[PDB]
RNA sequence: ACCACGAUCAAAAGGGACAAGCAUCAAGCACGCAGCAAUGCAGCUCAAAACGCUUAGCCUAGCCACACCCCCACGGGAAACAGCAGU
């Protein structure tokens, strides 16, 4: 029973980890889209200059 | 006079090195040195 | 526990954890993110520690 | 010194005590060879 | 092998219509009329495309190892000609040691990428010595004799049995 | 009763693979300094039978005692590889990792 | 126990642990592994102290070692109080 309880505790901590990682993923996606837009503008400027 | 003492010590040192080398192959069971072995004079130019 | 082999590892995984190897061949994994040192001590005492009754018997 | 240095060097090693003229004995028997005076 | 001199500069490869320009413009925008650093940049991107999973990431350990490898090759090429340049000898040796350290870290962290780097750049990873002690003449001679004596004793044992 | 070898289960790092079907492993234990009352690592070398030659230098392995020694110094066998060198799989999440960063995100599965 | 079942006690063998000083003792020189064997590989210990020299009975309900010497004792030196008392 102690081993089973330890496994259940691991599962609960895993659920909390997954929730936290999903939060991190949303904030990531936001900032990464922002940075990707900035880099798109930079590449546009560079391509125009080279042309 | 320091010279002759110094080369005498070098000669005794070479003799001791050769004696250790001989002890090795004697204990290993070889009656003579390994075929083609010759102890180099490493303490004399 | 002088006869138990304790070994430490650093920055090999994204998450800290403890693992206990038993004589039977079983392995016990204890995740320790978000847990204080006192909480970890209590957890290991509960799951793999001798109770006060056994110690008093000894 | 650091704790690592103290561990590696280990406990201090007091050198053995020096034996005196009696060689660590209370007294010694002797035979007189000659008598004289010193300043 | 170096890129052909006709290759376009890294900054002039994705510009639209670069194939529709005069031959003179192609010469002006090729490696033939640039310094060695542009050729090194072309080498670097070729290695990144051939080895790394994401050629755009330059902060990764494997990308850094590739960059240091290109730089080490440039130093070696420089030193073939300037045999008495001590500062660049120092830079080459330091770069080689740093790349060894990076390879050790990559091996400890990502073995598949470590293998792919070692194959792609032709790097033969070597393990460090265990003991750092001076091998003076007496030790060398004694070790050679001990090896010889072991060989002779092995022959004697094999024949006698 | 099951074995005459003192060390029944031990965890170590493979430091040598130059012998046939044998891995040389370094095992560290914590030993108290009687004077300083601080714990220091003490190292010991073990030879472990590795039939399949799957051990690489630097990987963390678990060794199980043989019922009896199979050689002068080989008293243990490779039970498993805890951490393959450079191919570590995170036990908490089960996903491959390179150091402290996930090679495959846990959310992906 | 005495039929052993098995306890108690405890050798040989296997695994582990186990004094001090000296690194001006830094290399040891076969000290490993695999195979039923034939044989194959070239390995094993070591500055986290190997190898060596010197000192010492020890961890005291006691334990270890020795028992004239040649570690041992077929054999040899040679004729034995390191049992008590005694010289
Ligand atoms: K004796
Ligand atoms: Mg016994
Ligand atoms: Mg004595
Ligand atoms: Mg007597
Ligand atoms: Mg006797
Ligand atoms: Mg008497």
From Swiss-Prot, chain B:
Keywords, sorted A to Z: Mitochondrion, Nucleus, Ribonucleoprotein, Ribosomal protein
Subunit architecture: Component of the mitochondrial small ribosomal subunit (mt-SSU). Mature mammalian 55S mitochondrial ribosomes consist of a small (28S) and a large (39S) subunit. The 28S small subunit contains a 12S ribosomal RNA (12S mt-rRNA) and 30 different proteins. The 39S large subunit contains a 16S rRNA (16S mt-rRNA), a copy of mitochondrial valine transfer RNA (mt-tRNA(Val)), which plays an integral structural role, and 52 different proteins. Interacts with Aurora-A.
GO biological process, one term: negative regulation of mitotic nuclear division
Name of the protein described by the UniProt record: Small ribosomal subunit protein mS38
Annotated compartments: Mitochondrion matrix; Nucleus
Protein family (similarity comment): Belongs to the mitochondrion-specific ribosomal protein mS38 family.
Biological function: May act as a negative regulator of Aurora-A kinase, by down-regulation through proteasome-dependent degradation.
Chief place of localization: mitochondrion
Lineage, opening ranks: Eukaryota, Metazoa, Chordata, Craniata, Vertebrata
Tissue: Ubiquitously expressed and especially highly expressed in heart, skeletal muscle and testis.
Recorded GO CC terms: intracellular membrane-bounded organelle; mitochondrial inner membrane; mitochondrial matrix; mitochondrial small ribosomal subunit; mitochondrion; nucleoplasm; nucleus
Curated annotation (Swiss-Prot), chain C:
Spans traversing the lipid bilayer: none
Keywords, comma-separated and alphabetical: Disease variant, Mitochondrion, Primary mitochondrial disease, Ribonucleoprotein, Ribosomal protein
GO biological process, any: mitochondrial translation
Molecular functions per Gene Ontology: structural constituent of ribosome
Subcellular location: Mitochondrion
Principal location: mitochondrion
GO cellular component: mitochondrial inner membrane; mitochondrial small ribosomal subunit; mitochondrion
Subunit structure as annotated in this protein's UniProt entry: Component of the mitochondrial small ribosomal subunit (mt-SSU). Mature mammalian 55S mitochondrial ribosomes consist of a small (28S) and a large (39S) subunit. The 28S small subunit contains a 12S ribosomal RNA (12S mt-rRNA) and 30 different proteins. The 39S large subunit contains a 16S rRNA (16S mt-rRNA), a copy of mitochondrial valine transfer RNA (mt-tRNA(Val)), which plays an integral structural role, and 52 different proteins.
Disease: Combined oxidative phosphorylation deficiency 50: An autosomal recessive, mitochondrial encephalomyopathy characterized by intrauterine growth retardation, poor overall growth, delayed psychomotor development, hypotonia, muscle weakness, progressive loss of ambulation, and mitochondrial oxidative phosphorylation deficiency in patient tissues. Brain imaging shows partial agenesis of the corpus callosum.
Family: Belongs to the mitochondrion-specific ribosomal protein mS25 family.
Designated name of the protein: Small ribosomal subunit protein mS25
Source organism of the structure: Homo sapiens (Human)
From Swiss-Prot, chain E:
GO biological process: mitochondrial translation; translation
Keyword annotations from UniProtKB, A to Z: Mitochondrion, Ribonucleoprotein, Ribosomal protein, Transit peptide
GO function term, MF aspect, one: RNA binding
Domain of life from the UniProt record: Eukaryota
GO cellular component entries: mitochondrial inner membrane; mitochondrial matrix; mitochondrial small ribosomal subunit; mitochondrion; nucleolus; nucleoplasm
Keyword Ribosomal protein tagged: yes
Compartment annotation: Mitochondrion matrix
Family to which this protein belongs: Belongs to the universal ribosomal protein uS15 family.
Assembly notes: Component of the mitochondrial small ribosomal subunit (mt-SSU). Mature mammalian 55S mitochondrial ribosomes consist of a small (28S) and a large (39S) subunit. The 28S small subunit contains a 12S ribosomal RNA (12S mt-rRNA) and 30 different proteins. The 39S large subunit contains a 16S rRNA (16S mt-rRNA), a copy of mitochondrial valine transfer RNA (mt-tRNA(Val)), which plays an integral structural role, and 52 different proteins. Interacts with METTL17.
Protein name (record): Small ribosomal subunit protein uS15m
Species lineage: Eukaryota, Metazoa, Chordata, Craniata, Vertebrata
Entire protein: shown range: 65 to 225 of 257
Curated annotation (Swiss-Prot), chain F:
Annotated compartments: Mitochondrion
GO biological process terms held by the UniProt record: mitochondrial translation; translation
TM regions (residue ranges): none
rRNA-binding is among the record's keywords: yes
Highest taxon above the source species: Eukaryota
GO molecular function: rRNA binding; structural constituent of ribosome
Keywords carried by this UniProt record: Mitochondrion, Ribonucleoprotein, Ribosomal protein, RNA-binding, rRNA-binding, Transit peptide
Principal place of residence: mitochondrion
Transit peptide, residues from-to: 1-17
Any one of the GO CC terms: mitochondrial small ribosomal subunit
Keyword RNA-binding: yes
Subunit relationships: Component of the mitochondrial small ribosomal subunit (mt-SSU). Mature mammalian 55S mitochondrial ribosomes consist of a small (28S) and a large (39S) subunit. The 28S small subunit contains a 12S ribosomal RNA (12S mt-rRNA) and 30 different proteins. The 39S large subunit contains a 16S rRNA (16S mt-rRNA), a copy of mitochondrial valine transfer RNA (mt-tRNA(Val)), which plays an integral structural role, and 52 different proteins.
Family, similarity comment: Belongs to the universal ribosomal protein uS17 family.
Name of protein: Small ribosomal subunit protein uS17m
Species classification: Eukaryota, Metazoa, Chordata, Craniata, Vertebrata
Gene this protein is translated from: MRPS17
Span covered, complete protein: 4 to 112 of 130
């Amino acid at each position: 029973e102690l081993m089973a309880w330890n496994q259940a505790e691991n599962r609960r901590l895993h659920e909390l980890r997954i929730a936290r990682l999903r939060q991190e993923e949303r904030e990531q996606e936001q900032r990464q889209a922002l940075e990707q837009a900035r880099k798109a503008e930079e590449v546009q400027a560079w391509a125009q200059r080279k042309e | 006079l320091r010279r002759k003492v110094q080369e005498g010590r070098l000669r005794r040192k070479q003799i001791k090195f050769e004696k250790d080398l001989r002890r090795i192959w004697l204990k290993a069971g070889l009656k003579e040195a390994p075929e083609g072995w010759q102890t180099p004079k490493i303490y004399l130019r | 526990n002088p006869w138990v082999q304790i070994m430490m590892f650093k920055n090999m995984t994204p998450s800290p954890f403890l693992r206990f190897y038993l004589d039977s061949g079983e392995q016990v994994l204890v995740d320790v993110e978000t847990k204080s040192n006192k909480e970890i001590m209590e957890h290991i005492r509960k799951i793999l520690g001798k109770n006060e009754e056994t110690l008093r018997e000894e | 010194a650091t704790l690592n240095q103290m561990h590696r060097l280990g406990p201090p090693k007091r050198p053995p005590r020096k034996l005196g003229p009696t060689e660590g004995r209370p007294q010694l028997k002797g035979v007189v060879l000659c008598t004289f005076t010193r300043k | 092998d170096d890129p052909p001199p006709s290759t376009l500069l890294k900054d002039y490869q994705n510009v639209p219509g670069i194939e529709k320009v005069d031959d003179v413009v192609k010469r002006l925008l090729s490696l033939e009329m640039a310094n060695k650093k542009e050729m090194l940049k072309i080498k670097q991107e070729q290695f990144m495309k051939k080895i790394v999973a994401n050629p755009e990431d330059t902060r990764s350990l494997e990308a850094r190892i590739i960059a240091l490898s290109v730089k080490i090759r440039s130093y070696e090429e420089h030193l073939e000609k300037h045999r008495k340049d001590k500062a660049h000898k120092r830079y080459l040796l330091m770069s080689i040691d740093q790349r060894k350290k990076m390879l050790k870290n990559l091996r400890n962290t990502n073995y598949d990428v470590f293998e792919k780097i070692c194959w792609g750049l032709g790097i033969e990873y070597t393990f460090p010595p265990l003991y750092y002690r001076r091998a003076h003449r007496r030790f060398v001679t004694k070790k050679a004799l001990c090896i010889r004596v072991f060989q002779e004793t092995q022959k004697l044992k094999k024949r006698r049995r | 009763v099951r074995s005459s070898v003192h060390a029944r289960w031990i965890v170590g790092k493979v430091i040598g693979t130059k012998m046939q079907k044998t891995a040389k492993v370094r095992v560290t234990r914590l030993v108290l300094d009687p004077y300083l009352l601080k714990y220091f690592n003490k190292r010991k070398t073990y030879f472990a039978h590795d039939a399949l030659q799957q051990c690489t230098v630097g990987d963390i392995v678990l060794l199980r005692a043989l019922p009896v020694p199979r050689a002068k110094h080989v008293k243990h066998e490779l039970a498993e590889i805890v951490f393959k060198v450079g191919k570590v799989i995170d036990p908490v999440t089960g996903k491959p990792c390179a150091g402290t960063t996930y090679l495959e995100s846990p959310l992906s599965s």
